[PDB]
């Protein structure tokens, strides 16, 4: 399975979306931030060639997204959610980050949100290139017209890193 | 004239797709892509390899 | 039939061209003669004709 | 290795062709010096070779 994903994971300008179920994987609340931190240092590090922002959609409630946002802020990682309180904003989620090449600065590096009807509609508006469903999710309101639907199955974050070519051993 | 120029002209002599070395001038790198010197771990696979027909020359 | 040759010479331009042209491997040390350098560059494959300019400066 | 340039009247565009491998393949008359030098000492039949040298003069 790892060798089947390497050709797609080698393109710098390629949009990847993630659909993750927190319950399927173990120790999600204490290792998801580290997984994001060591995913972007490898796939979203270059300021010119890595020109598309990853999107992580978690099957959880809105009230749990603030904790993830503040945990990310504590680690000095800039992300957007699209929620401020309990109201979702279409413009904020779909905005394109601004880049300053001479300063190696980008305003945000990930779109971390929850699984909801409003969020799913935003995904369909701007279709991605690869979609990774992790843990098993319905995904019945998403337009899979010209999008790869590679289903990844794991039991821990080490396996996900091994599959995504971020670690040489299981 | 207060113009700092540090330009190196290099020539491709192979690729490192995976854990093995393939020769040939192909897969031109995109602009603004880092150069990372070279490590002894990857140089020990291009030359040393592993086979009975190995002759050391320093 | 099972023979091989190792031609060693400090003046490659003065060695017979019929024999030096059959050599496939070259171990070139420092060369300070223009004619010898040109002859070696002609013998060497095009894959190394760009790195062959380091011959006069070999330590 | 295994690629040939075809230039002639039978083709309109000269090109490089990756030739396949024969099945069965011809015999290879190549001597590997290093693997033959890695074995034990070999003593040839000096009487047979000089006898052939003497007899095969015409």
Residue that the structure tokens 């047979």 belong to = D48
Long-range contacts from B8-17, C-beta under 8 angstroms, 24+ separation: B11/C50, B14/B46, B16/B42
Instruction: For residues A70 and A49, give the distance between their C-alpha atoms in angstroms, rounded to a whole number.
Output: 29
Bridge partner residues of D17 (DSSP): D4
3-class SS of residue A117: helix
Resolution (A): 3.0
Q: How many residues does chain C have?
A: 59
Q: Computed from CA positions of residues A124, A126, A127, A133, in that sequence, does the dihedral angle turn out positive or negative?
A: negative
Residue that the structure tokens 């995976």 belong to = B18
Instruction: For residues A25 and A56, give the distance between their C-alpha atoms in angstroms, rounded to a whole number.
Output: 15
Helix (H) or strand (E) holding C37: helix C34-43
Tell me whether residues B55 and D35 touch, CB distance under 8 A. Answer: no
Chain D contact set for B55 (CB, 8 A): 34
What subunits make at least 3 CB pairs under 8 angstroms with A? B
From the number of C-beta atoms within 10 Å of its C-beta (0-12, 13-18, 19+), residue A111 rates as buried
Chain A contact set for B30 (CB, 8 A): 12, 49
Instruction: For residues D22 and D44, give the distance between their C-alpha atoms in angstroms, rounded to a whole number.
Output: 35
* B contact residues 28-47, partner A, Cβ 8 Å cutoff: 30-33
C-alpha separations of B31 from A49, B15, B18, B47 in Å: 8, 17, 22, 29
Instruction: For residues A73 and C14, give the distance between their C-alpha atoms in angstroms, rounded to a whole number.
Output: 75
What subunits make at least 3 CB pairs under 8 angstroms with B? A, D
For residue A25, which phi and psi values (nearest 5 degrees)? -90, 150
* B contact residues 38-57, partner D, Cβ 8 Å cutoff: 52-53, 55
Bridge partner residues of A100 (DSSP): A105
Chain B contact set for A51 (CB, 8 A): none
Q: What is the CA radius of gyration of chain C?
A: 12
Instruction: For residues D29 and B2, give the distance between their C-alpha atoms in angstroms, rounded to a whole number.
Output: 66
Contacts of C2 (CB under 8 A, 6+ apart): D31
């Amino acid at each position: 399975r790892k060798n089947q994903l390497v050709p797609s994971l080698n393109i710098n300008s390629r949009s990847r979306y993630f659909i993750i179920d927190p319950d399927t994987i173990d120790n999600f609340d204490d290792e998801f931030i580290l997984f994001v931190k060591d995913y972007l240092d490898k796939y979203n590090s270059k300021i010119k060639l890595h020109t598309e922002t990853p999107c992580f959609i978690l099957k959880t409630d809105v009230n749990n997204l603030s904790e993830y946002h503040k945990r990310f802020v504590s680690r000095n990682i800039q992300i957007i959610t699209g929620y401020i309180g309990d109201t979702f904003y279409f413009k904020e989620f779909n905005k394109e980050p601004k880049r300053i090449i001479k300063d190696n600065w980008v305003e945000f590096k990930a779109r971390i949100s929850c699984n909801s009807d409003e969020v799913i509609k935003c995904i369909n508006y701007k279709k991605c290139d690869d979609l990774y469903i992790v843990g098993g999710v319905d995904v019945s309101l998403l337009d899979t017209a010209d999008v790869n639907i590679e289903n990844l199955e794991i039991n821990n974050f080490r396996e996900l890193k091994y599959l995504l070519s971020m670690l040489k051993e299981i | 004239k207060d113009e700092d120029i540090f330009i190196l002209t290099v020539q491709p002599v192979g690729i490192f797709k995976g854990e093995e070395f393939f020769q040939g001038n192909s897969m031109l790198p995109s602009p603004t892509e880092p150069v990372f010197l070279v490590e002894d771990d990857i140089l020990n696979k291009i030359f040393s390899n592993e086979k009975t027909k190995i002759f050391h020359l320093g | 039939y099972g023979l091989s040759l190792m031609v060693v010479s400090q003046r490659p331009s003065e060695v017979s061209d019929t024999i030096l042209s059959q050599c496939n491997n070259f171990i070139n040390l420092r060369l300070t003669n223009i004619n010898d350098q040109n002859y070696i560059k002609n013998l060497l494959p095009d894959n190394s004709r760009s790195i062959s300019e380091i011959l006069p400066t070999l330590g | 290795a295994g690629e040939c340039l075809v230039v002639g009247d039978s083709t309109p565009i000269p090109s490089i062709v990756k030739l396949e491998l024969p099945n069965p393949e011809p015999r290879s008359q190549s001597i590997k010096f290093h693997k033959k030098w890695s074995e034990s000492w070999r003593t040839p039949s000096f009487e047979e070779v000089i006898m052939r040298w003497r007899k095969e003069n015409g």
